[PDB]
């Protein structure tokens, strides 16, 4: 019954129905999503107490946003009023070789983007939570969200609260310099994190780490990661790797400690909607942590949850512990009947 | 900041879009409604702390039901698991002289209908609320919901908690005997109520009251009601009266005490959907009470809220204090712009 | 329990939702309608045995058409296979002063339009029905549908079967000559009809009748109509008249015999969709006939049914005897609850 | 042109669009389904005369239900009025490893569940049908539906009418005792059946049959089934077996007689919606029977029909003989053009 | 065949269907609107050549925006690429006394808001148009759009091109100072305008004009307006006035010159959606101008067009000259049939 | 920047949502499609100037049709008014082994079908285009469209304009004689074509060509095609071949000249909607031509475009050059993010 909070952004996602494009229809389904929303929503569905720390404008759209947070099972007690705008993006679902297309709208002028550390009573919040997840987006959105994130991490550390962080580095959306700038910001918060979500390529391409070319394969892989971990004395480092054999796609999760490495077996992956699916993996890892599960049990549970998120339309991973366990325990049951 | 709870039923409402009939389309929009849901939802939108005391099956439908309660701003902390079924009804929206058609499905075999007083920790709940509304439906649904409602009222009285009750007597859906049976049940709970919602016809047709034929008009009307009130020592009695001049329909609210009578002026009424609108009037009355408003201010506010509920599709009165006041203060403004 | 058949056309109606225009959305709801469909559908809902005599292409669209006829309660036993096309039209619903816009597609190349008398076993059909309604459209669609309609009327007369006919003359969609041509065709079938649906303007503008200018008002009106009736020895002549006072619109029905005249009182009319509403009036008249009702009872019942059809989206008048009677007997009840 | 009737239940199925969950949208498509509905609907589409024997409440929902039966091509002549409720369930469509979730609502308090043998004129019905299918659900729903089913089977036998029956045993929804109770009820009706639908596991797990452990493979399989068949002197026993190789899923149908065994070749299976697909297989078997087809032709036709049902959204197998034959005869044609 | 261009903003409008609120559904219909879009769209439907001068981001959303402009009949030749964001707002449709609620999102960080005069080849554009409408929003959105608007007006004047301008002053969305600031900007562009759209209250409340208190009624009204007009030597000044008698609402249009005044008779107004309806009135006025119509004919035509826009869902006035004339010439025809 | 025009037909396509059948829902999405529309739409998206030469009725449906052409980026300048009807078809999307079902409505009585060469100012059009594509449908629809197509080809040749033509021969929709008749018409236009789209089977089955039985495989294949090409002195001949290995389907494109042969490698094909996908391949070929690309580059680009069209719902291939190139250059990127 670990109480988890997240400091992050709420965004509006607009999606045409089925596999339609924006130019084909005026119809849309809108939802309130975001790394912190997806994470906390899934954890709330796993029956943990969750609360989102952020800001929403004091208007009907902001009110609809808070209603959505509650519906998902997330407490909106620490969602304050500020600004007038909410960040958003359009998502046109792809099919086969036609890629899914995400188009972002203004994000930095949002209620969350214009709020600063002084707008949040971190002291009061930390006193009621055991763990706090700082969304990587906070570090890059604006100087104000970055300063707030850093202060929160430092504070969380002081209160001896567990700190979680996700790398939100997207090569394609960054220039050479921006990457370096983000490097600096990540290096500033990493010293305060206990659980980190990210990939090998992040360490190399973003944090400039260099792999022991005298090593190779797993050994090289593990050496680089556990090195990064001991440097910041991280407790857990986790992520997933996508692969594809002829015809099939697979998802595999990994979980490292400074002295251990646990990888799940490749899981066939069927992609209906992958947006935000990375947050379902993290939710599974954090859940395993809250239950003091072995690294093997946690990575297996989290990887299955990640695969499940790809079969769920939209960013929010709406899964339960029983559902995930049913997939693991009963792989051949494709239809469940209840209410009899 | 009065904390209000309600003991009642949650029902599924199925409605075809626009003004379509069941035989015209397979399409539907479903919502979780009920007297207690409508009431608490509106009060939560008026910014009061609300909580629903009831049961929902431990299945995906029940889970979606709790999610809906939270979305509306109602705490689901006291919603327990029980049964497998949820009551429901279909609502085919009418137009002009074509009446709206409501068709009920099984209601008594619901999770709420099969739960008894021993399934609820009333002691613990009452300790955290200042007022409790007992939905009239509780008294007629099943012997179990009736026994639970009576026990709750008695208990609420002991704890000196304010008690609210709504007459849910529908002539058309009752036989001669059933009416008499309900009379007995109402007479049993009325001694414990402080605020009661109902109409003159209820007192006469259900409670068998007889009006002073030596009197007439308002005087006769008031004599009968304040007599009923002093008999149970009720604090507030409120309801609405619908009328129609040539071409127009009107709504008028009234609020009585043992020594006073406040009636609002007739308000033109436009009917898009009247289902549950009676609960918006009650919410307005209760809100006025929580703010210690004059009888005039409360009845005026509540009547406008009632008219507004008729313009809102569905049972849930999703109005705010500012919205109601804007209608009162700015009758000619039909379009509001925000977020500038 | 009069068994009624109709000889007519089935058409596809495409309607964008709400009050949207074709240029605003790609969305549509399609339905199978037509004078004969609307008529028989309503009569089937009034619990009479009905059957449509027509043709539909032997393809999936034609099959969906027969399924729709059955759903409405109309027997599809006499619906034969022929052609490949089905007539259709688009209906963009108007609002306020913006008129409803109907746009027709090819109608004469339909399965019904290319079928001739020899394609129908009228002898066998007439042997199982007591009344047959010949849709006025049959006389103008094509020479083949016209020849079939005339033969059916003659035959129906021989078998001493009651014959009903509706004037389907639309001034706006006819040239000077076409009107004259249709005059001839109507004069050919009228000698075989018992019950006729039409208006005063039809007699004057289409049948070239001339009113006694020495008379005026009702007397003149009645003289012209009963004159037309005795000439063809018609049993019943019925129709409706639309009027408008300041602010309100009204509908009024009239029913004539060679020696009587019954007019209903003006009924306030609210227009959501008037397409095909004329067929609901006729259905009410025919129903009154089947029940051997007085002219007053029939015209009152039919006029209310006509008003109700205007509140129902789409051409099909989906009303029941109880519903109509409820409107007459309980004018102030706008919401009906059942299933308790 | 075999005339087939079915004694069974009509249920409401609620399904959110696409692959959405109940917690994601208020939107739904509702349909009238049930074993007897699915079966007769498919057979009617195969052009056989069909009629459903059951009860529906005398309200608008019940009326919409009868309209749906007719639309599907099923006669509603023997659908009587009774009760007020209709059983129902929600179906949230799964995708990939996310299973489809079915949630049932009250089923036993339905119009069909409260009706007894005395409410049905079986004598009159049997006189107009050549075959009658008794839905296995009848035996377990309520004592009243069970007693009615047994009486109907006995009667059908007396009139020498062919009797069909489907095992509706779901391990997951039964306790140890309930299974035994159902065993008894099945043993009571089996002596009257000619054609039975079920699986090997039913015989072993439900009917407690024991396989010759001295045998193995097909021989053992066949020995057990033909033993069960001769015991009740059944004419046909049929069912399907689902299997899965790496990557692909398959469906295979089997048809036994007391002296023969016909199995179809594995057919690749693509699952869009499997609910009720078992009734499409049965419809194919019964159709083959009505045409006096060889066991090979019947099992091949039925298996393809079963695969097709999985590609059709919803429970109702809306297939035609030509469509099934086209799949068999032209496996590479994925697009058919008509109406040219 | 006057060629008209407009310099303005394109915005995204999100609207839930029917009269639903944001908190009731995730469903939306999105459209590309804006003063310049609404104006040019209607004029294009009136068959004039139109072109919008603005910027849209070079992304899929911007591309969908240009597609919408073309669909409406507006040339997108002068729509350049710039920025990444598009302004937007949500519109929850009201009903009866429940007002319509508009909630704006970020508008100043749009592609249009960040573009400056140097980004537009006004010289080249002006050479191909006879008239240019400068949207009042340009003057208040950003300093860059303001500077561009002013430069365009000056240039248009030099080329002797007709210049149109609309007051976009909304009291409710402005502070005391902002109003004064806008006063200055309007005073700067007014000297270059020929046709101006606005109301009396704009002159008084925004431009600080003072009415001759020694005068009254029409005389006073006209004195103030023709004074404002001669000061800037304006050619035409037009607008509308909304009024309401008991039960009904009315719309009335007025058109002034320095020496004349033409007012239309009050037109009953039915409000389905008034957003942008003001642009339909302007389109009617401009159309009358392009046809060199009398002031009476222009104001009558424009007022009817304005009333029609209120019956059309959405901001875009999709009316034609024939449609408007049909309403004027045939007030009692509520249904038009074509394609016969 | 090649300016391309097409002479062809516009049709209405009606499609139920998802994979629903006509008998399952009244809902539909309608679109304006046709060989010429699909072709020009894709080319316009590839940024070439396009214009459709055809006729549309002068009614609201025809107007909506022109609006759709513009939205797609196609100039509607040469779309004239004529007739009253528009051809159409219904498309029920298949799934797995359930084929997609297309049902045509009347096509020959359309505005395009009743127009003749004298209704088109080919001289004026040809003067503004560099290439003209004559849709094969023109040759078979009606004698009038055929005569117009032939005249246009002859004229285009005179003006030395590039001429493109597509074989629109569907074996299944033709009798023995009709095929021969079409042979004659194709032989008449082929002498004027430069670029032709079709398959080997067309040459053999329609044009009666005979393959060198002394040859085999590729050599035989190429001999037959280059023989057909030199006979009419064609410049380019292109088409695609569908194949299927166990489990997978593939698409392969080929491009021939009189002296060369270029075939693309098999591309895995995923079929969501193949209707009109053949026009996306042609658009890719023509685009390659306009860019003077090598045969290899053109066939590779076009085949990928063809595969992409199968993943797009509806007939219109809405792809861009960058999108196609992204699929070729980045095969493993299934999600693209923009607007950052
Ligand atoms: Mg996802
Ligand atoms: Mg209401
Ligand atoms: Mg109607
Ligand atoms: Mg199925
Ligand atoms: Mg408007
Ligand atoms: Mg395609």
Residues in D touching E26 (Cβ below 8 Å): 24-25
Binding residues of F for Mg(2+): 275
| Bridge partner list, D240 | D253
- Chains contacting chain B through 3 or more C-beta pairs under 8 A: A, C, D, E, F
Is residue D279 within 8 Å of residue D137, measured between CB atoms? no
The answer to whether C225 touches C234, Cβ cutoff 8 Å, is: no
Q: Which two tokens stand for residue E98?
A: 């429940």
User: End-to-end CA distance of chain E, in Å?
Assistant: 31
Of D26, D92, D106, the CB nearest to B109: D106
Tell me the chain F residues in contact with residue B24 when contact means C-beta distances shorter than 8 Å: 26
Decide if A61 and E103 are in contact by the 8 Å CB cutoff: yes
Domain tally, chain F: 1
> What residues in D contact A313, CB-CB < 8 Å?
18-20, 24
- Rg of chain C over Cα atoms, rounded to whole angstroms, equals 20
Cβ pair E258, E234 in contact under 8 A: yes
Q: Which ligand is nearest to the CA of E308?
A: 5
Residues of chain D in Cβ contact (below 8 Å) with chain E: 24-27
Ligand 1 centroid–CA A243 distance in Å is 17
Least CB-CB distance to B339: which of A59, A67, A68? Answer: A59
Q: How far is the CA of C25 from the centre of ligand 5 (A)?
A: 17
To the nearest whole Å, the CA of C22 is away from the closest chain F CA by: 6
Q: How far is the C-alpha of F140 from the C-alpha of F179, rounded, in Å?
A: 10
**3-class secondary-structure state, position A202:** helix
Taking the C-alpha atoms of residue B184 and residue B182, their distance in angstroms, rounded to an integer, is 5
How far is the CA of F97 from the CAs of A56, C324, D247, D308, F15, in angstroms? 49, 49, 17, 7, 19
Say which experimental method was used: X-ray
Which positions in chain D have a beta carbon within 8 angstroms of at least one beta carbon in chain C? 57, 59-61, 67-68, 70-73, 84-85, 338-340
Cβ distance D104 to A327 less than 8 Å, yes or no, reads no
Q: Are D160 and D150 in contact (CB under 8 A)?
A: no
Burial (CB < 10 A; 0-12, 13-18, 19+), residue D251, is buried
Contacts of B111 (CB under 8 A, 6+ apart): B54, B55, B56, B57, B62, B81, B82, B83, B84, B85, B86
Question: CA of B223: how far to CAs of B167, B210, B226, B254, D106, in Å?
Answer: 20, 11, 6, 14, 47
Paired sense of beta strands C49-56 and A249-256, if any: unpaired
User: With an 8 Å Cβ cutoff, are C337 and B173 in contact?
Assistant: yes
Can you spell out the DSSP letters for E93-144? --BTTB-EEEEE---TTSTTTT--GGGS-HHHHHTT-SEEEE-HHHHHH-HH
Q: Where are the beta strands (DSSP E) in chain C?
A: 3-7, 11-15, 27-33, 49-56, 79-81, 87-92, 100-104, 131-134, 162-166, 195-197, 236-244, 249-256, 261-263, 267-268, 335-338
DSSP string, F268-284: E---S--TTHHHHHHHH
Residue in E30, E60, E109 closest to A106 by CB: E109
Contact F303, F263 (CB under 8 A): no
Q: Do A73 and B71 touch (CB under 8 A)?
A: no
φ and ψ of E212, to 5 deg: -65, 95
Handedness of CA A69, A75, A81, A87 (dihedral sign): negative
Separation of alpha carbons C260 and A104, rounded Å: 74
Question: Are residues A326 and D172, on separate chains, in Cβ contact within 8 Å?
Answer: no
Q: Which chain B residues are Cβ-neighbours of E95 within 8 angstroms?
A: 270, 272, 311-312
Structural domain for C297, as ranges: 1-340
- DSSP E strand stretches across D118-161: 131-134
Phi, psi of D242 (to 5 degrees): -95, 140
- Element at D153 (helix H, strand E): helix D143-158
Structure tokens at C35: 């004078």
Alpha-helical runs (H) found in chain A: 35-45, 60-71, 122-126, 136-141, 143-158, 176-189, 200-205, 217-232, 277-290, 295-309, 321-329
- The torsion region of residue B18 among left (phi > 0), alpha (psi -120 to 50) and beta comes to left
Packing angle of the helix pair A277-290, A295-309 (nearest 10 deg): 150
List residues, by chain if needed, whose CB lies under 5 Å from ion ligand 2.
B 273, 276-277, 309
Distance between CA C200 and CA C221 in Å, rounded?
8
Q: F218 to chain D, minimum CA–CA distance in Å?
A: 23
Tokens 């065949």, located at residue? E1
Among B40, B67, B84, the strongest candidate for a mutation testing the A interface, having the largest count of A CBs within 10 A, is: B67
| Backbone angles phi and psi of B221, in degrees to 5 | -55, -55
Query: Which residues of E sit within 8 Å Cβ distance of C?
Result: 17-18, 29, 71, 247-248, 268, 270, 272, 304, 307-308, 310-314, 318, 323, 326-327, 331-340
Cβ C73–D70 below 8 Å, yes or no? yes
CA nearest neighbour of F21 among D41, D250, D268, D279? D41
**Residue D195 known to bind ligand:** no
Query: Residue E192 Cα, ligand 1 centroid: separation in angstroms?
Result: 55
Opening angle at CA B96, ends B94 and B97, nearest 5: 85
Q: Of the ligands numbered here, which is closest to the C-alpha atom of F41?
A: 6
**Distance between CA F106 and CA F141 in Å, rounded?**
11
E171 DSSP assignment: G
Note every long-range contact of C239-245, with CB atoms under 8 Å and residues 24 or more positions apart, other chains counting.
C239/C197, C239/C198, C239/C199, C239/C200, C239/C281, C240/C199, C240/C278, C240/C281, C240/C303, C240/C306, C241/C199, C242/C269, C244/E332
Strand partners, A33: A11
> What is the C-alpha to C-alpha distance for residues A286 and A166, in angstroms, rounded to an integer?
12
Q: Residue B26: its chain F contacts at CB < 8 A? A: 24-25
Helix axis angle, D176-189 relative to D143-158, nearest 10°? 20
How far apart CA B53 and CA B43 sit, in angstroms, is: 15
Instruction: Tell me the chain D residues in contact with residue E27 when contact means C-beta distances shorter than 8 Å.
Output: 27
- When CB atoms are compared, the residue of D103, D271, D275 closest to A339 is D103
Q: What is the DSSP letter of E192?
A: G
Helix orientation angle between B277-290 and B295-309, rounded to the nearest 10 degrees = 150
| Pairwise CA distance, residues A84 & A109, whole Å | 9
Tokens of C147: 């020849």
Residue D312 Cα to ligand 4 midpoint, Å, equals 6
Q: Which residues from chain B sit within 8 angstroms of residue E101, using beta carbons?
A: 336, 338
Assigned token pair, C59: 């393809």
CB D247 within 8 A of CB D234: no
Query: Which residues from chain B sit within 8 angstroms of residue E23, using beta carbons?
Result: 71, 318
Contact at 8 Å (CB) between B142 and D98? no
Closest CA to F95 of F16, F29, F167: F16
d(CA D135, CA D34): 9
Could you say which of C19, C95, C102 has the minimum Cβ distance to residue E337?
A: C102
Breaks in chain D (C–N beyond 2.5 Å) sit after none
**Angstrom distances, CA of residue B91 to CA of B61, B106, B273:** 19, 15, 10
The pairing of beta strand B131-134 with beta strand B162-166: parallel
Backbone φ and ψ of A301, nearest 5°: -60, -45
E337 contact residues in C (CB cutoff 8 A): 102, 104, 170, 172-173
Q: Could you say which of B29, B327, B336 has the minimum Cβ distance to residue E97?
A: B327
Report the distance separating Cα B52 and Cα B68, nearest Å: 12
- The residue in chain F having the minimum alpha-carbon distance to the alpha carbon of residue E74 is F70
Rounded CA gap, E253 and E234, in Å?
A: 18
Return left, alpha or beta for C34; rule: phi > 0 is left, psi -120 to 50 is alpha, else beta.
left
Q: CA-to-CA distance for F202 and F222, rounded, in angstroms?
A: 14
Minimal-distance CA residue of chain D relative to F25: D29
Strand partners, C4: C50, C131
Q: Is F61's CB within 8 Å of C90's CB?
A: yes
Say which CATH number the domain at D18 has: 3.40.1190.20
Answer left, alpha or beta for residue E71, where phi above 0 means left and psi between -120 and 50 means alpha.
alpha
Question: Residue D102 forms beta bridges with which residues?
Answer: A337, D91
User: Rounded to a whole number, what is the largest CA-CA distance in chain D?
Assistant: 62
| E contacts of D25 (beta carbons < 8 Å) | 26
Nearest CA-CA distance, residue B26 and chain F, Å: 7
The CA distance from D204 to the nearest CA of chain F, in Å, is 34
β-pair partners for E91: E102
Q: Closest partner residue to B318 among E18, E23, E105, by Cβ?
A: E23
Give the DSSP H/E element, type plus range, for residue E305: helix E295-309
Residues D50 and D64: their CA atoms lie apart, in Å, by: 19
Give every CB contact of residue B326 below 8 A, 6+ residues apart in sequence: B333, B336, E99
**Residue whose token pair is 């609404």:** E38
- Rounded to the nearest angstrom, the gap between the alpha carbon of residue A311 and the centroid of all alpha carbons in its chain is 17
- CA-based nearest residue in chain B for residue C19: B18
Q: Which of D98, D102, D170 sits opposite A311 (nearest CB)?
A: D98
Q: At A165, phi and psi to the nearest 5?
A: -150, 140
Give the minimum alpha-carbon distance from E339 to chain F in angstroms, rounded to a whole number: 5
* Phi, psi at A323, each rounded to 5°: -65, -45
């Amino acid at each position: 019954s670990l109480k988890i909070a997240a400091f992050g952004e709420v965004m509006l996602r607009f999606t045409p129905p089925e596999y339609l494009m924006l130019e084909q229809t005026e119809q849309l389904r809108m939802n309130f999503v975001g790394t912190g929303v997806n994470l906390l929503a899934n954890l709330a569905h796993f029956q943990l107490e969750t609360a989102l720390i952020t800001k929403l404008p004091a208007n009907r759209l902001g009110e609809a946003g808070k209603a959505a947070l509650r519906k998902l099972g997330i407490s909106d007690q620490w969602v304050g009023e500020k600004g007038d705008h909410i960040g958003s993006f359009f998502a046109e679902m792809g099919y086969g070789i036609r890629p899914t297309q995400v188009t972002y709208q203004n994000r930095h002028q949002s209620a969350f983007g214009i709020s600063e550390a002084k707008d949040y009573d971190f002291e009061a919040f930390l006193a009621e939570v055991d763990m706090v997840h700082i969304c990587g987006i906070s570090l890059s959105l604006t100087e104000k969200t970055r300063d707030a994130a850093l202060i929160l991490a430092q504070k969380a550390h002081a209160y001896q609260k567990k700190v979680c962080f996700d790398f939100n580095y997207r090569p394609s959306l960054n220039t050479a310099n921006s990457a370096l700038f983000m490097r600096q910001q990540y290096e500033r918060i990493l010293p305060y994190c206990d659980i980190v979500f990210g990939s090998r390529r992040d360490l190399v391409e973003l944090l400039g780490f260099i792999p022991r070319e005298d090593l190779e394969g797993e050994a090289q892989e593990t050496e680089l990661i556990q090195r990064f971990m001991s440097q910041y004395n991280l407790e857990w480092f986790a992520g997933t790797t996508r692969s594809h054999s002829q015809n099939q796609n697979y998802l595999s999760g990994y979980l490292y400690t400074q002295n251990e490495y646990q990888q799940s077996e490749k899981r066939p992956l069927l992609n209906l909607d992958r947006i935000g699916a990375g947050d379902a993996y993290a939710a599974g890892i954090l859940y395993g942590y809250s239950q003091n599960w072995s690294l093997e049990k946690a990575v297996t549970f989290a990887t299955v949850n990640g695969v499940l998120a790809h079969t769920i339309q939209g960013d929010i991973p709406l899964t339960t512990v029983k559902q995930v366990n049913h997939v693991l325990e009963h792989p051949n049951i494709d239809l469940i009947r209840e209410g009899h």
